[PDB]
Ligand binder design. Structure first.
Ligand SMILES: *[C@@H]1O[C@H](CO)[C@@H](O[C@@H]2O[C@H](CO)[C@@H](O)[C@H](O)[C@H]2NC(C)=O)[C@H](O)[C@H]1NC(C)=O
Ligand SMILES: *[C@@H]1O[C@H](CO)[C@@H](O[C@@H]2O[C@H](CO)[C@@H](O)[C@H](O)[C@H]2NC(C)=O)[C@H](O)[C@H]1NC(C)=O
Ligand SMILES: *[C@@H]1O[C@H](CO)[C@@H](O[C@@H]2O[C@H](CO)[C@@H](O)[C@H](O)[C@H]2NC(C)=O)[C@H](O)[C@H]1NC(C)=O
Ligand SMILES: O=C(O)[C@@H]1Cc2c([nH]c3ccccc23)CN1
Ligand SMILES: O=C(O)[C@@H]1Cc2c([nH]c3ccccc23)CN1
Ligand SMILES: *[C@@H]1O[C@H](CO)[C@@H](O)[C@H](O)[C@H]1NC(C)=O
Ligand SMILES: *[C@@H]1O[C@H](CO)[C@@H](O)[C@H](O)[C@H]1NC(C)=O
Ligand SMILES: *[C@@H]1O[C@H](CO)[C@@H](O)[C@H](O)[C@H]1NC(C)=O
Ligand SMILES: *[C@@H]1O[C@H](CO)[C@@H](O)[C@H](O)[C@H]1NC(C)=O
Ligand SMILES: [Ca+2]
Ligand SMILES: [Ca+2]
Ligand SMILES: [Ca+2]
Ligand SMILES: [Ca+2]
Lengths: 145, 51, 490, 102
């Protein structure tokens, strides 16, 4: 194994991935000491996993993530080598809508992270709430920055 | 009492508008006052129709 | 790196990313054999014109001694095919020396990159480039997500961000007094944020959105059929489409097949001037479309340079051979005599009315060049670096060019000031066009019927001439796109 | 020589293994794809003409192919397989944030 820390940041993850794909990169771009990574386990963030998936599926290196659950990573046209051991977030937005329907609320607010995780999930929840006659007062986007 | 529309504000936000004489509203969260049938008027509370 | 490139050696190398092809071959790899390189299909003449704009700008800078004297700009320009993978191969070529130095001799050091066109493609390219602080000045990536400097440190654009465009769509809908509209967006980093901004604006302006459907160029027949069913079931005549040409082509073709008429199309800038949608045989569907277009620019001598193309004469442009082979349907299929006239075949390469994205590429190249000029013509104690130190133009680095690009303020050939704000963005007006059928020919004439003033305050930005709008392409009556008819007095 | 259990951090003070189990499953799924490459009968393979890959000189795309056709068993005796989008559908647990009485 060769395991690097991403720090929940796309930059660190792409340096680590460039380390991962070094042999394939030099083969496709023109020393055997560089190891050949056969597959990658990661990453946590969905934007980080998106960048890493672009780079890895460029060389068809399988990438099995464990925490990234964005629905955008289910697009096999863009992400050919991406796999998930975590469920997609299509069902979690529907589950939140069902929770709001169960407790007989119709006036709610929404906050989401300004990344590939929060935005698709909150859009799916907005769709489900509109189907279930729930009025969303506000929709806000936040980030750690 | 039926549901009246607040302009510029979504459907979940409504006003309570009392039903007029002749019409009534029997259920809650009703969007329309229903007229009592022929040979029938509405009681004081507009919750039912009496002959 | 990738082949079919356009490369010229020089003291300073500007990378390029252009969509010479509209897409790649839709062949899902079964992985029973080693996956080969995907092929690029649907040759794009407009993207080739954009590449020619980059080359023309670089040649102009190399010829004029007033800008960067005795310093030659070279280029390595690749084809992205609107695909993330191809642009990432090109970007890996751009960062070869940088990644060798960071991770681990004659490989050119890309000082800056011009591109790409797609917001998702530019997002991937920016993710890769920001590792090494290589400036990337896009010409057609208008997604708000690319304004995040915490994730895209070295990203710049000569195109306006698309929040003003969504606000303009909402203002247009409010102007004609509609409250019952449907929204369509491409499922990518361009359509989704723009349609979300439009949704916020419409909620602010009390416009009910009936349906919000996502589309893509790879959408299955089931998804396209479902979206067409949603459109047909809805009574919303006005449909706001915030998408691009290739991503909207399947939906438009399917709607043309079933002859859905009377829909009012509000076009985003990506497809409002698209040859893939503005086809003569789609006018009974997309006629009368009201779309946005960027500022038209002027590049004196650009058309002559475009008409000076030749596969053998142009040795630094490897795309010229395929351009010739698709222009005249020849092979160098009848043989390419090489004496064919560019002014004989009607293509978007020459049959253009305005230079909007081409002017964006021109501005990108000149922004890079003026950053290099500021690096060169700088007094020793007034540099934009530590203790006022100056960069060395003989050994200039990418991050220094990025620093000078952030604090860039230069003048256009049009006399317009060009700077990039703290978000690495450019602010620009819009022109509102209406798709008119040509009387003389069958082509879709884009008639300018209004403008949007981003500098004006809210509520005064829009200007439309309704007398110049032909609704659905034939009608002078503003259509009715309200869910319910007006309640009368009493 | 400090004792790991002395300091309360999320490293040991955990109640359930949810994402840790996801990492475990990712590793075991890659391992089982590699095993399917290894336990491959000559005429029965996922590649052209039913050919099988060489475990000694295996390539990433071959492991991707076997991962797309991977259907193995957990240590909890539950089958793991990936759909056409490489997803693993699973249940959710609705939890409530309370306050510890002690
Ligand atoms: C909050 O609003 C919801 C709106 O859905 C109410 O749920 C409705 O309650 C009426 C009352 O009988 C039912 O007829 C509807 O079928 C319910 N709709 C649902 C569950 O979607 C809910 O009762 C309201 N609660 C309060 C406390 O006002
Ligand atoms: C469609 O609905 C809109 C939304 O109400 C109508 O716009 C109103 O128009 C009247 C008179 O033109 C104004 O006094 C209101 O302020 C407008 N409301 C707005 C802008 O929210 C529009 O008239 C309707 N069009 C029809 C019925 O053809
Ligand atoms: C954006 O559009 C506005 C309006 O079309 C431009 O403002 C006009 O400028 C001309 C001179 O350039 C004046 O004669 C007009 O009176 C102005 N119209 C207004 C203020 O409504 C504006 O210049 C455009 N932006 C840029 C950068 O040129
Ligand atoms: O896609 C994403 O970004 C999230 C990240 C994430 C999930 N669950 C977590 C638990 C701990 C820390 C991070 C996470 C779900 N997928
Ligand atoms: O950000 C984006 O994706 C769009 C792509 C795009 C624009 N204009 C175009 C003209 C032709 C082809 C593509 C485009 C505007 N920015
Ligand atoms: C449109 O309405 C028909 C009516 O039965 C329905 O079958 C179809 O699914 C609808 N289209 C949608 C929901 O996209
Ligand atoms: C589509 O409908 C229009 C009238 O709405 C008609 O003129 C035209 O011939 C129709 N085309 C097809 C292919 O059905
Ligand atoms: C750019 O420079 C001009 C001087 O030519 C000045 O008038 C203008 O304010 C400057 N703009 C910015 C944003 O610095
Ligand atoms: C996986 O294999 C088991 C048999 O061990 C079978 O019952 C199950 O249907 C299989 N699942 C898939 C998705 O192939
Ligand atoms: Ca991570
Ligand atoms: Ca309001
Ligand atoms: Ca592109
Ligand atoms: Ca086009």
């Amino acid at each position: 194994y060769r395991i690097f820390d991403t720090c929940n940041t796309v930059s660190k993850a792409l340096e680590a991935t460039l380390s991962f794909v070094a042999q394939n990169k030099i083969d496709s771009l023109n020393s055997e000491h560089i190891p050949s990574t056969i597959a990658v386990v990661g990453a946590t963030g969905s934007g980080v996993s998106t960048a890493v998936a672009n780079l890895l599926g460029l060389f068809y290196i399988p990438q099995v993530s464990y925490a990234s659950s964005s629905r955008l990573l289910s697009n096999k046209n863009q992400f050919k080598s991406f796999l998930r051991t975590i469920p997609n977030d299509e069902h979690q937005a529907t589950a939140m809508a069902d929770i709001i329907e169960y407790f007989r609320w119709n006036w709610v607010g929404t906050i989401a992270a300004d990344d590939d995780y929060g935005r698709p999930g909150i859009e799916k929840f907005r769709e489900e709430a509109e189907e279930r006659d729930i009025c969303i007062d506000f929709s806000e986007l936040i980030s750690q920055y | 009492t039926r549901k009246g529309i607040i302009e510029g504000e979504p459907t979940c936000c409504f006003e309570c508008v009392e039903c007029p004489d002749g019409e009534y509203s029997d259920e809650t969260d009703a969007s329309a006052c229903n007229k009592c049938p022929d040979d029938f008027w509405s009681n004081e509370n507009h919750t039912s129709c009496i002959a | 790196g990738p082949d079919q490139r356009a490369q010229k050696k020089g003291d300073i190398i500007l990378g390029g990313l252009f969509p010479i092809h509209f897409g790649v071959a839709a062949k899902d790899q079964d992985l029973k054999s080693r996956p080969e390189s995907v092929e690029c299909i649907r040759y794009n003449f407009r993207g080739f014109r954009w590449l020619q704009a980059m080359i023309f700008a670089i040649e102009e800078i190399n010829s004029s001694p007033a800008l960067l004297p005795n310093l030659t700009l070279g280029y390595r320009i690749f084809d992205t095919c609107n695909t993330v993978s191809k642009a990432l191969e090109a970007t890996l070529s751009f960062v070869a020396q940088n990644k060798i130095d960071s991770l681990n001799e004659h490989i050119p050091s890309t000082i800056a990159v011009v591109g790409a066109t797609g917001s998702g493609v530019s997002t991937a390219v920016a993710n890769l480039l920001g590792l090494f602080y290589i400036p990337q000045v896009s010409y057609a990536s208008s997604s708000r997500l690319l304004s995040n400097k915490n994730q895209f440190k070295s990203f710049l654009r000569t195109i306006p961000n698309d929040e003003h465009q969504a606000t303009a769509m909402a203002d247009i809908i409010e102007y004609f007094r509609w409250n019952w509209v449907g929204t369509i967006a491409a499922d990518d980093d361009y359509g989704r944020p723009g349609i979300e901004k439009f949704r916020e604006e419409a909620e602010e302006r009390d416009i009910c959105i009936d349906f919000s459907e996502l589309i893509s160029q790879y959408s299955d027949e089931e998804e396209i059929q479902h979206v067409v069913e949603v459109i047909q079931n809805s009574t919303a005549k006005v449909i706001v489409v915030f998408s691009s040409g290739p991503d909207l082509e399947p939906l438009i073709k399917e709607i043309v097949r079933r002859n859905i008429t009377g829909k009012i199309w509000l076009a985003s800038e990506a497809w409002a001037s698209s040859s893939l949608i503005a086809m003569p045989q789609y006018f009974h569907v997309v006629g009368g479309t009201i779309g946005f277009a960027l500022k038209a620019g002027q590049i004196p001598g650009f058309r002559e340079f475009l008409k000076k193309v030749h596969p053998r004469k142009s040795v630094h442009n490897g795309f010229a051979k395929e351009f010739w082979e698709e222009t005249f349907n020849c092979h160098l299929r009848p043989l390419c005599t090489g004496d064919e006239n560019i002014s004989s075949v009607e293509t978007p390469y020459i049959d253009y009315t305005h230079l909007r994205i081409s002017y964006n590429v021109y501005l990108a190249v000149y922004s890079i060049a003026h950053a290099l000029q500021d690096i060169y013509t700088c007094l020793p104690g007034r540099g934009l670096f530590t203790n006022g130190s100056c960069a060395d133009i003989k050994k200039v680095e990418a991050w220094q060019v990025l620093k000078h690009l952030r604090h860039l303020n230069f003048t256009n050939n049009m006399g317009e000031q060009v700077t990039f704000d703290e978000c690495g963005d450019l602010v620009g007006n819009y022109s509102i066009i209406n798709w008119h059928l040509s009387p003389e020919d069958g082509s879709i004439v884009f008639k300018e019927v209004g403008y949007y003033n981003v500098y004006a305050k809210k509520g005064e930005r829009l200007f439309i001439n309704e007398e110049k709008i032909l609704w659905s392409g034939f009608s002078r009556e503003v259509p009715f796109s309200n869910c319910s008819r007006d309640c009368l007095a009493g």
